[PDB]
Write a protein that binds this ligand. Sequence first.
Ligand SMILES: [Cl-]
Ligand SMILES: [Cl-]
Ligand SMILES: [Cl-]
Ligand code: NA
Length: 86
Amino acid sequence: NDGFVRLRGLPFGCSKEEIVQFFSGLEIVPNGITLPVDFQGRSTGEAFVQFASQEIAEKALKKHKERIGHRYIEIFKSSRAEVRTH
Ligand SMILES: [Cl-]
Ligand SMILES: [Cl-]
Ligand SMILES: [Cl-]
Ligand code: NA
């Protein structure tokens, strides 16, 4: 159970509080949200999220185009490999 997804479209400066609550009831591992510390990634609104299992990550994939504030959040399958080397 790798459990990784990739987000796109987050608001610039979107907080971890907003991302966790967007995924309310889908368990994220400790430090499971990886944010860009760079400007193009922040402008894209990229993040990676590591859920506690692939079964949980499969449920997260269904939230595609739900909102954080004004923005429609895009949700893609990902992997440990992609989080480490992106
Ligand atoms: Cl933080
Ligand atoms: Cl920045
Ligand atoms: Cl929505
Ligand atoms: Na991906």
